[PDB]
Design a protein around this ligand. Structure first.
Ligand code: HEM
Ligand code: HEM
Ligand code: HEM
Ligand code: HEM
Lengths: 144, 142, 144, 142
């Protein structure tokens, strides 16, 4: 991947504008509702039988916040994303057994949640840069 | 397959958004051709879709009219959308990899324009619906 | 002036979408408030001492509706605007003594009222075509 | 000259819109360069203003920061905006015919974004204010 200054600014601007404690739980909960096989590695104790239960699940909420904080390292170092995520990629493949496809599904849910927050400001070029950035992250994480 | 709850959910969301369907369609097509530039070839003949250009209500109504058709034929999408499958596969020769792309861009627009109504439950039902529409549209390709 | 098919469609689309009985009174009343010397030829009987009085004035409201209906002839015949408005231009100069500058002021108020109605749909290209059309009309009317 | 009612009106509207001032500024500049293409030369160095491109909050904040300055210096615009007059006349060499153009595009954006708050009374006061700002900005040109 190559990044321009304009692109680096946009990513910084988008993420700066987000409340991770609101947006993170929304993105992961949405992923567990729209792609319910992504419940696989949650709900080890409680149940996740409907949207209200998933949105109410504390561990899911906490992890959506961890995902957003995890994306910060990439926001700040867009040219080293592969290297930055190497240990989290191993964790999610070797210890957690997360399917690499699940990162693409979460990225889509995050894009839909960020679009709702930005409204008309999420124009075509903004979406293009945002999705390019997530795609690079997804590629780094989805290594086995 | 769509459950009765899914079909209800799709109809309810559609009742809330159908009045803005020209705008939804224009916004989805315009972002598709920018974000997914392999698609520009399909819409270069509609230069109104360039950002900043005046909106042609009939262009947005084209695509969202297909979605409206699908909502009315929601009990049998394959039969309902078979003519539109033929149009895309034979007449227009749209590469079928793009149905999932336009689907995503429609969800993005709905989320932007109707954030209160586009709940995760609305989204799962609408996404299943649009997977159904894309499969129906893909029927005549092979 | 030359007009493309795209431009002719846009003008037809914008005007089709308007409620002339709402937009007309709003545009003329706004002109009499923002450029209050344009009261000159109204208020021959009643007074126009504030915004509420101008917006309440029946003759001003009626005339804003006549302006919008008057623009229809141009919407439908964009290549003959000069000729179409020749009799109304004479009326407004020779009988009414309207200053030709007043047409430009009203055109601006109409653009501000149409922008409020269309919201984000009134994008840069839409404004460009809309203002080009009004400019042609203003040029035809402002002949002495 | 601005009356005390005008100054009150401008402050009140500004209190309602200042939180969207980056967006107002970007939207006004972008439409100016399209509608009034003689102005594109002034902003070609900011390609973010092209419709569809990602918005740079600092670009919108530039122009609307000048308007915010003017609101704070509303009792003496000529003195308040004298440095900004020098910047536009000498440093940037912006043709002074364009101050009335950008003024109009700001009113159009405000009307689009805040139709309830942009009443005819708000508009007359804001227009007088922006005539005042344009005259202050024009001070150093000759
Ligand atoms: C951009 C995408 C993602 C990022 C940045 C991310 C980040 C993180 C982080 C930082 C942790 C904590 C690691 C630790 O124990 O120290 C974690 C844990 C976890 N993640 Fe993710 N993750 C992402 C996507 C996913 C997806 C898609 C799934 C499943 C659908 C998932 C499932 C989990 C689970 C189950 C844990 C908990 C492990 C435990 O209880 O020990 N993650 N993730
Ligand atoms: C949700 C998926 C889609 C729906 C519901 C849909 C619907 C429709 C409809 C109803 C028509 C009008 C057919 C007619 O003239 O009778 C149409 C035309 C067209 N579609 Fe789609 N379509 C879809 C996806 C796509 C995709 C993915 C592409 C290209 C990337 C595409 C490109 C076209 C083109 C180029 C036309 C011709 C437009 C014209 O010049 O009249 N469509 N579509
Ligand atoms: C696009 C711009 C305009 C259009 C299309 C327009 C159209 C019309 C029309 C159709 C009439 C009725 C003519 C008749 O007696 O049969 C009229 C009357 C009038 N217009 Fe306009 N007009 C415009 C602008 C203006 C402006 C800017 C002013 C003044 C500020 C103005 C002042 C009047 C007055 C005072 C009358 C009334 C004459 C009477 O009582 O006999 N008009 N206009
Ligand atoms: C309401 C009228 C205007 C206001 C309040 C305004 C305000 C400002 C402000 C505060 C600055 C920043 C100066 C600095 O660096 O300290 C600026 C810069 C600039 N203005 Fe304006 N301005 C106005 C009109 C115009 C017009 C009409 C044009 C051109 C058509 C123009 C073009 C510029 C340019 C090119 C810059 C330099 C931007 C950059 O690269 O930093 N301005 N203006």
């Amino acid at each position: 991947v190559e990044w321009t200054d304009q692109e680096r600014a946009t990513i910084s601007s988008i993420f700066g504008s987000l409340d991770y404690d609101d947006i993170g739980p929304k993105a992961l909960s949405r992923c567990l509702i729209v792609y319910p096989w992504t419940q696989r590695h949650f709900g080890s104790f409680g149940n996740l039988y409907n949207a209200e239960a998933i949105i109410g699940n504390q561990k899911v909420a906490a992890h959506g916040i961890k995902v957003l904080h995890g994306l910060d390292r990439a926001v700040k170092n867009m040219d080293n994303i592969k290297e930055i995520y190497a240990e989290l990629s191993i964790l999610h493949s070797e210890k957690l057994h997360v399917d690499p496809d699940n990162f693409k599904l979460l990225a889509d849910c995050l894009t839909i949640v960020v679009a709702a927050k930005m409204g008309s400001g999420f124009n075509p070029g903004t979406q293009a840069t945002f999705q390019k950035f997530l795609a690079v992250v997804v590629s780094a994480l989805g290594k086995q | 397959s769509l459950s009765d709850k899914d079909k209800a959910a799709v109809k309810l969301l559609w009742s809330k958004i159908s009045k803005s369907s020209d705008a939804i369609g224009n916004d989805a097509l315009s972002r598709m051709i920018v974000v997914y530039p392999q698609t520009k070839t399909y819409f270069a003949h509609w230069p109104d879709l360039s950002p900043g250009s005046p909106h042609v209500k009939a262009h947005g109504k084209t695509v969202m009219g297909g979605i409206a058709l699908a909502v009315s034929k929601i009990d049998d999408l394959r039969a309902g959308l078979l003519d539109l499958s033929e149009q895309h596969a034979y007449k227009l020769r749209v590469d079928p990899a793009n149905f999932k792309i336009l689907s995503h861009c429609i969800l993005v627009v709905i989320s932007m324009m109707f954030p209160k109504e586009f709940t995760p439950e609305a989204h799962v039902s609408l996404d299943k619906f649009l997977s159904g529409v894309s499969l129906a549209l893909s029927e005549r390709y092979r």
